[PDB]
Structures are given as structure tokens and as C-alpha cells.
Amino acid sequence: SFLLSKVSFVIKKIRLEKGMTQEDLAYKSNLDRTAISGIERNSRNLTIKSLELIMKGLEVSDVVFFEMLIKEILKHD
Amino acid sequence: SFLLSKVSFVIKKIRLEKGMTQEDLAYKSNLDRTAISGIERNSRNLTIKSLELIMKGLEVSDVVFFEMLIKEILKHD
């Protein structure tokens, strides 16, 4: 699907712009590394609560995240 | 948790703007009515795939959804 693949793509794009490894995010987001890897490959089973934990771990506001998700969808869907 | 409470607010807001019942949304979204009620009652997490199916069931684009969520967070914190 287009949404979960865009959510993952935006998580990875921000994590690398902040210079972070999957381990680093895992530790800051309170989710296991395998979880992070999994979501970055497919975000279908990401919950909203976890996505919030990920945003806190990237240190990115929800609003910014959503604005990048919309920009990605609009420009590339 | 904060994100989920605004997501739950936006779902309910759109559902009622559209004049749809919870039963109607449940059927169109592939999610139990018990599920929908819990999501709106903040007593229940939600996956992105679930949120996707809800948007389809509301017949709103993800972009419009997320823009409404951003306005809600921004104007009302």
C-alpha cells in the first residue's frame, strides 16, 4: 500500500538526516532494533503509539513528520 | 497518549461531518464496531494499516486527514 510504505520511507529519511543508526533509534524510541528494521521495510503493523515514540526518538515534532509525509505523498503519489 | 487522542478526535469529527454511524464506518473500514468505538474512546491503539482502512471508510484522502490532524494539533495543542 501507498501509506505504510510512505510512513516507513519518511521514518528512514528523517533517521538518516539526523545521522542515526537503527540501533540508535531503537534505543531512543523504546522499540527493538528488529522492530525498527521491520517497520522500515513495512510499516503496516506500526501502531500510532509507537509512531509517536519514533517521532520522539528522531526528535521531530509530529506536525513536521506529517508535513513531510504529505509532501512525499503529494509529490510522488 | 497525545498523538492517538488527536487521531481519535479527527476520525470522530470526520465521521460525524459525514453523518455516518460507527456501525457504518465499521462495515466500510473492515474493523469491528467495538474497535471503532474503542478508537474513538481513546481506549484502543490503532495500526497505520487500520488508519488507512478508516480513511477509505470515511472516503477522505490521507493528505486531507493528516492536514486536519495538523490543524488540530496546531490550533489546539
Author numbering:
A (entry chain A), B (entry chain B): 3 to 79
From the article:
The three-fold difference between these two mutants indicates that both the phenyl ring and the hydroxyl group of the tyrosine are important for interacting with the DNA. This indicated that the role of the tyrosine was more than just the formation of a hydrogen bond with the DNA backbone, but also involved the phenyl ring common to both tyrosine and phenylalanine. The ΔΔG for the phenyl group alone (comparing the values for Y37F and Y37A), is −2.8 kJ mol−1 (−1.4 kJ mol−1 per monomer). In terms of crystal packing interactions, the Y37A crystal structure is identical to the triclinic wild type structure but adopts loop conformation I in both monomers in the asymmetric unit.
The C-protein binds at various sites within the C/R promoter to regulate transcription of its own gene and the associated endonuclease gene. Unusually, in the RM system Esp1396I, the C-protein also represses the MTase (M) gene by binding to the promoter at the transcriptional start site, denoted OM where the C/R genes and the M gene are transcribed convergently from different promoters. Flexibility in this loop is very important for DNA sequence recognition, as it has been observed in the nucleoprotein structures to adopt different conformations depending on which operator site the protein is bound to.
